[PDB]
Amino acid sequence: KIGESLPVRRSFRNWISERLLLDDQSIKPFIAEIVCGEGISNFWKDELWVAVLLSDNSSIFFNYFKRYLLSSDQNLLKRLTFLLRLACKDVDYDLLKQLG
């Protein structure tokens, strides 16, 4: 229903990031249903993991999904490094200022 265009994806990522801040415990079953689910198109799983990796809560999910991360031939754990290197970075304006 919500569609697949890019402004919607940004708004979904914001919405998840807010639910993880305001402690609505109904979200954790939903997140588990996606992460263990089938038929969900993979770019939604990627947007969800970017929201997790940008949140302060992040270490909790590694505790919760330990055996899933390890046993799946580390396939998901490899995707996480790709997403981390692409999305989770920012411009280093201090260093630009020191270079003039």
Binding site: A32, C36, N63, Y64, R67
Partner: protein, 99 residues
Amino acid sequence: YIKPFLDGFNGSEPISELFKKFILVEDRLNTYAKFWKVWDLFFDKVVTLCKDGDRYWYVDKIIKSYLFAESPWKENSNGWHTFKDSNSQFFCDVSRTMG
């Protein structure tokens, strides 16, 4: 330790008695991670066994033992000291696979 029972696994009655004794000793000792390691190693064998149908030999009794249904629990428990939020994935896999 458990390798002779993993290699020889079948539908015979002492497989049920084994699971009941592990549950009893864990209730005495409260050794969380070690219990869940033992339970994680038997999962695929039990899953393979139910696909023959639970009417054979003692298969239904083995299923009931593995899923905590044969032990004499107290009448008004709030929970069990070996169950935590993380372990809900066990019942998810079970209901996905042995339904």
